[PDB]
Symmetry: D3
Amino acid sequence: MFLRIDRLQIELPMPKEQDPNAAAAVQALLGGRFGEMSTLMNYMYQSFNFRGKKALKPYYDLIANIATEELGHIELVAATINSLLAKNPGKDLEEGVDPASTPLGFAKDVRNAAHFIAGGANSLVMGAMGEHWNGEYVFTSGNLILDLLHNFFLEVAARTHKLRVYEMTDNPVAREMIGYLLVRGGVHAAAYGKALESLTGVEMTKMLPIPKIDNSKIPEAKKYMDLGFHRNLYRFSPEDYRDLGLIWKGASPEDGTEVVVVDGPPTGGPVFDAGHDAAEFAPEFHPGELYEIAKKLYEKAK
Amino acid sequence: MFLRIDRLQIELPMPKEQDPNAAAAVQALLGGRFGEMSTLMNYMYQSFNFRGKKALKPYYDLIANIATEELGHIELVAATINSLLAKNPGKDLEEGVDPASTPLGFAKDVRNAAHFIAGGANSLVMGAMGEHWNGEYVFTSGNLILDLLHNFFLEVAARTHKLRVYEMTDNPVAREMIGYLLVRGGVHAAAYGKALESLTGVEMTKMLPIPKIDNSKIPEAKKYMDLGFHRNLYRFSPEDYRDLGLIWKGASPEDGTEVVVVDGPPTGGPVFDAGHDAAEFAPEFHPGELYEIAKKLYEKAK
Amino acid sequence: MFLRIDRLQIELPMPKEQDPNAAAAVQALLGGRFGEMSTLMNYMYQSFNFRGKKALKPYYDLIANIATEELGHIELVAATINSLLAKNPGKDLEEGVDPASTPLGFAKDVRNAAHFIAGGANSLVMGAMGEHWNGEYVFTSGNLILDLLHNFFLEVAARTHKLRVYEMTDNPVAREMIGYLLVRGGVHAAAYGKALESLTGVEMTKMLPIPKIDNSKIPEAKKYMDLGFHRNLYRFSPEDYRDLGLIWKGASPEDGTEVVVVDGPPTGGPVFDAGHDAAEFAPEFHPGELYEIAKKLYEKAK
Amino acid sequence: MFLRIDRLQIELPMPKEQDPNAAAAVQALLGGRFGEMSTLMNYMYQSFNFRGKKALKPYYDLIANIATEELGHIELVAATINSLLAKNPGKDLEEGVDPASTPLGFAKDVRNAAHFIAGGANSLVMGAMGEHWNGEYVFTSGNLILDLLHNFFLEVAARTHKLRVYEMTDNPVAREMIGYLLVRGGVHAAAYGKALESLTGVEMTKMLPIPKIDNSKIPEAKKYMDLGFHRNLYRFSPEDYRDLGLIWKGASPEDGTEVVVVDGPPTGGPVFDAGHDAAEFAPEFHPGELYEIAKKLYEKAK
Amino acid sequence: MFLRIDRLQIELPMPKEQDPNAAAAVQALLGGRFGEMSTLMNYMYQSFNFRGKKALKPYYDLIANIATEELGHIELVAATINSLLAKNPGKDLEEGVDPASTPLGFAKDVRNAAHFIAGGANSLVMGAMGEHWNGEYVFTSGNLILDLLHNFFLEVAARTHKLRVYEMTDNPVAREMIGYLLVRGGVHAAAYGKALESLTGVEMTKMLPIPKIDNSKIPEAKKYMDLGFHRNLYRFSPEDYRDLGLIWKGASPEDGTEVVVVDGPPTGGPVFDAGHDAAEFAPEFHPGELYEIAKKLYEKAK
Amino acid sequence: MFLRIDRLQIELPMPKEQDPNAAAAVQALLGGRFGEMSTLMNYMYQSFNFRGKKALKPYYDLIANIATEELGHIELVAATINSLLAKNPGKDLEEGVDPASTPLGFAKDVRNAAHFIAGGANSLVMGAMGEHWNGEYVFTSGNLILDLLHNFFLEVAARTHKLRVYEMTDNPVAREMIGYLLVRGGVHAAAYGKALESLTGVEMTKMLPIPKIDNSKIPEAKKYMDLGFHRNLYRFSPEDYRDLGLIWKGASPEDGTEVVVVDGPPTGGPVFDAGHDAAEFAPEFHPGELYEIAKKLYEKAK
Ligand SMILES: [Li+]
Ligand SMILES: [Li+]
Ligand SMILES: [Li+]
Ligand SMILES: [Li+]
Ligand SMILES: [Li+]
Ligand SMILES: [Li+]
Ligand SMILES: [Li+]
Ligand SMILES: [Li+]
Ligand SMILES: [Li+]
Ligand SMILES: [Li+]
Ligand SMILES: [Li+]
Ligand SMILES: [Li+]
Ligand SMILES: [Li+]
Ligand SMILES: [Li+]
Ligand SMILES: [Li+]
Ligand SMILES: [Mn+2]
Ligand SMILES: [Mn+2]
Ligand SMILES: [Mn+2]
Ligand SMILES: [Mn+2]
Ligand SMILES: [Mn+2]
Ligand SMILES: [Mn+2]
Ligand SMILES: [Mn+2]
Ligand SMILES: [Mn+2]
Ligand SMILES: [Mn+2]
Ligand SMILES: [Mn+2]
Ligand SMILES: [Mn+2]
Ligand SMILES: [Mn+2]
Ligand SMILES: [O]
Ligand SMILES: [O]
Ligand SMILES: [O]
Ligand SMILES: [O]
Ligand SMILES: [O]
Ligand SMILES: [O]
Ligand SMILES: [O]
Ligand SMILES: [O]
Ligand SMILES: [O]
Ligand SMILES: [O]
Ligand SMILES: [O]
Ligand SMILES: [O]
Ligand SMILES: [O]
Ligand SMILES: [O]
Ligand SMILES: [O]
Ligand SMILES: [O]
Ligand SMILES: [O]
Ligand SMILES: [O]
């Protein structure tokens, strides 16, 4: 079972203005083959399908727990996309938008028109070419070593996509999200590498980094490492998965320092609200009446 | 962000036999168009994309919270499929399997060979025809009423699929899961119906049930209604989404009785472990050495 | 624009038994790559996209008119599938079905479970492997000769699929439909062949038949040829497309006799009603109340 | 069976010049998930699959007839796309185009290059991201109420897409088509809402409009309402489907006025011919010889 | 550029019976995600896309050459499927087949009806669920180490699928092919492992075997190891790719013995001819006349 | 089996600078429905699946041999795309690229962002809309005439796509590749036309050219015809497929001159190396160390 906390894993800054094509690129990191939907769903299904949940508990704890962290990663990437697509972030009501004036004319020419037609200028479950995420992006073989090898690869392929998208987008919201997730994915690759070392004797962490560029070269990632985030494997559970430190121990590939298991989630930051976009009819063409209905619900609870 | 509890939402019975084609049918309820992946991802993305998270808070709480419940539903359906595919449920080691003896011969003739080739006799992210789940199964328009109308329909379509699959197999593991999720889906349809009533004045819950058959006629669903579980909307959050009762109030469609919000998840049941299946090399061809490695990780003194 | 006549293009026989796997095979002829959805949508879009609708009018008339015939062919193939899936053909009410008795148990083991889960034991927009029909099955290049060459090939590929499916099932409903559509497809291939001859001088009809087997060797096709139906190109329009005989003239490939345009559709046969299937909740679990509602709508006096 | 009339459901104006990206956006309304292919194919297959064609005749008439209207809607949207893609609308011959001069250079940079590579600058069976229409966009459950609920949703989701595309495209051809189809889809949603009211007692039409914006705010739609088109359900059949007025009666959601069944199709407008585009080789590189062949066909018919 | 030799990479045994469902399983090894189409197209595109073809030549030679071997592997797997589907292997003519006798009746009930409808009882470009091979099964990142890590994983995933299919069928044609390709895939995994060791210092070959079962335990693989074939990396080029031994050197993972480059292909075996299948119209319904045409082409004197 | 020669079928010129959208258009010719992957895989699978390999040998030789030529065509088109995507063609090391400077900013706005995210600025297995190539683009019926008719169509449809892309792209690398492949595809269509003439008596080559434009109007193609390349069917085999001249004889459709079989491949031109692109991490972020590793491999081979 799962619980939800209404916080992003990190706070995000506010864009100056909408950037459709940046959003379209960041979609690769959400619904593309090596996006956060893929790391999420790989580890989630592997955790369901895991054989030897007690006999191989340290490894089950690892996969089950990282799966849970990836839920917050799809959330964070979606928030980044939504921030880039928001007309009026935080503004509950805009008046005077006239559909006859072609208020979405810009969207005719952007890469991803689906963001504005199918979405209400919001994230979709797709990659940078509009390709919808698919379940064949999941590998769940039941063989622990084969799955872990897959997962080590998956994390460094995902890293490579994050680096490339970072190099496309100058928006601070994207750069902050990517810098943070470069550090988190670095932890995951290190953890799966340590798991493989324990099971096979092959020194997988010595292959890192892939590509051969340090996260320290990405300023936003460097800041998060200066805060210690590359050391941290958070236990995203009230009471379970207490044996993470049997694998998540020893040296960090980033700097050689001792890694640590942190009890509980980080404190994070606020969730994002894109506000009213009347031309998208989102959350309504003119939401004033619906806001009054919601206000009255609180009154009649008395 | 999210947390995980290492428990299924309910206790499931022990499978007494492998039933591949029953598993293949139950896959519709996991990765088909109207399976639990679809209710999950619809509500998850709508929750990310929600505009007016404070101004329309009761409705945000509702979608965000139901999304979180659906995480446990994909888990429960996957455990059911894994139960139907398990050769040696709960058993850490089977010896003496020889690939040359054709130990997967039965799998040649089953509907879903992928369960045995791609999976290690485990669940996959697909429906009853082998179709992998896809992101175009998600509707996230940004318009609150349009989304809620979609979701009401989605829940009753999903219910229809559950009823049809129930009629295909008398397997007790599958029927236990379906009975429970008929009740839970009944709550979700009722909740979206109540949300629509509040926003539009249209008495959507008076359309229920769809199809025109009562859950009380399904013995395994009646079991859970007899415990009161159709009344309960569980708040799957430590501290957030506290305004569910502004919508989740008034009469149950099942029996006219007053519905209630329950703070926190139900107690749950243990997770499922399919055990060793040597022919699937899962978790290893012979996992004895890996089990010894895992045991030695605990020798870590202190 | 289009009009509809509530009749199948031919009378079909009453199914005597459900035959799921025969239905699954016949789906190739509906939603597979070379099924009736493909001939329909190819000619429909080519007709929309046609350049020179006046300057090349005989060829426009041909494609526009054959497209219209193919609407009745998807209808006929769907009726055939529905006949093979019908539990109680023509019967408005069956009572006493109990879901707990596993009334869909047989469907667990059939090839196409989607017919029973997604469909209410009815046709779906897919082929013999469950693959949903897709728009990339359409070729609409704007170049008349290239399109016509495509269409000649399409018809003989479709014929090949019909012959193979015919050889898979001796079901009389399926064979009646296939015999008729072998004849109709023979007309379409001949017509596109004659169109190519007129534009290029290449004697395309001399390539027929493909494969090298005569329709006269298929008893159910010979039935319709014995009535003269291989001669007939029906003009499915009240007033338009009057120049078909500029192309549809000269010898039939079947027997060398003169072909003719028939103004208007053939008489047809009744539509098919699969009746009540309570286990599929179709048209309702118990439709008695809905039938009473419908009856009362007629009480509307005047 | 079906018949064809060589008229669009409304006349369309002529664009000043080609607008590739407008065409690419309008594709959502043709081959996207909530485009006219989807309303067409949903109602078409539901009509084939309908159980109780006599006992539930008013509802069968409704679905069967609306399906027929949607055939003219795919035609109208395709004509709109073709109008936006036409280089030389109405012009049968352009001379002097040299492929070596890069006459399609502009198409290198447009959103939808397939329009110019796979199509001969013509419509394709796809949406606004190039995604080909697929049969999984059809819902045909066999359960009348479930299907009608689906269809009510489908029409208002389609409306939402039409409004968004309208807000992207200032081209009169697009605005006229969309204004007209907003009114027609308004009729369909009202009709399915009235059908649900009759079967369930739930006042579905009171939910309209969705989104909460009146068609009267869209100038082209307002004109069509001033002509009475929101009242009209046309009977697209010579002799069938005569019981539409048992459901299609009472108040219009637009203005409260009495709705009416119109015997027969509207008179409509001319079909569209994009003319010659030599760089697309459409209908031929230089069609002069083919036009002479067609002329001679009329001579030799004497 | 490429050349072709009209020989399979090994001699295969004569099939003694048709086995449709065995063919359907073996399709996973052809067009599934981890089939030979995937190893082929991965290495082929990586070879095209390779940066540093001179500066990193040993690694280019390796990928370019293994790609070429995989061409013969798709050929070998297709021949195996065709053997399992052949009615009359090696026989040019069967007379007396009558379509009306339902000669394809068995095919109604097999898993893969497409083999008999779309194919003429022959291989298709698809996996074990009928899923057509797709280009998203290719990973071509341009980063040498990332690609090589991918390829190491790909080979051991492919091996896992081969082992599972081997366990599904005791058909001798299938098992001969699988035994040989277990050996060949073992060479490829070892070679990519050695390439990774050279570039990273990580002892990837020490992870082998994955799964933890030796090829020597599969009798048909041991057959080929007993001939020495696990030592051999064949250079499939007349004059190019001469630096393979810079990487393909040192110990075999199978037995610790020294591996070698073999200049040129192995001798091979004859190609397979499934013979006439009249019910499939393959190569014609009755090919006697075509055989006479072919014979007469040789009468060409000189 | 197959062999590889490290030469392109023709030399290609060097672009002045990267042209992403030209690359995206040329992708249609690689992985689109009528691209070189399709001609390749059609003929390859038809050759595997061919019945009567001896009795119909001239036709088997033709398909098997043309399949082999198409391998070099996917190679040539990929080289063209890679040339258009290369930042630094031929340059082994660029220093000073800083990811923090947004060095991929241009790629945010191009049509095909996947080239820069999933690819390392390299070719992908997809068409001009990002659609990945799929195995349903292959037709392998087992019926010789039906397949040959398909293949004649396939070649002229492919030609049409090549002409359209030529008209979009002024880059010499694209124009040279397309001019050459127009001539080669002209040979293939002529050859399949001659095969059909021999088997059927229908004068298929008289339909050529399709579209009705001569290759002589494309300057690059004209040059290759002036060199005689339209006459040449190269035998891409050491010793096999020696009966091509039984079909490949008589008049060329281009100019009436006698066609010829050439023993062996053409001499071709150099393969292409895109060089270092540090922002793509291709072949490494900074490949200096890897180049030193490769150098040392040659030293330690002594
Ligand atoms: Li911006
Ligand atoms: Li640090
Ligand atoms: Li625990
Ligand atoms: Li519970
Ligand atoms: Li239990
Ligand atoms: Li008839
Ligand atoms: Li009948
Ligand atoms: Li314009
Ligand atoms: Li009005
Ligand atoms: Li009637
Ligand atoms: Li060999
Ligand atoms: Li043999
Ligand atoms: Li350029
Ligand atoms: Li010449
Ligand atoms: Li030979
Ligand atoms: Mn992540
Ligand atoms: Mn991760
Ligand atoms: Mn659920
Ligand atoms: Mn639910
Ligand atoms: Mn037809
Ligand atoms: Mn036809
Ligand atoms: Mn419509
Ligand atoms: Mn409509
Ligand atoms: Mn291989
Ligand atoms: Mn391999
Ligand atoms: Mn080619
Ligand atoms: Mn070719
Ligand atoms: O991740
Ligand atoms: O991540
Ligand atoms: O991550
Ligand atoms: O759900
Ligand atoms: O559910
Ligand atoms: O649910
Ligand atoms: O057709
Ligand atoms: O047909
Ligand atoms: O047809
Ligand atoms: O529609
Ligand atoms: O519409
Ligand atoms: O509509
Ligand atoms: O492979
Ligand atoms: O392989
Ligand atoms: O392999
Ligand atoms: O080709
Ligand atoms: O080509
Ligand atoms: O070609």
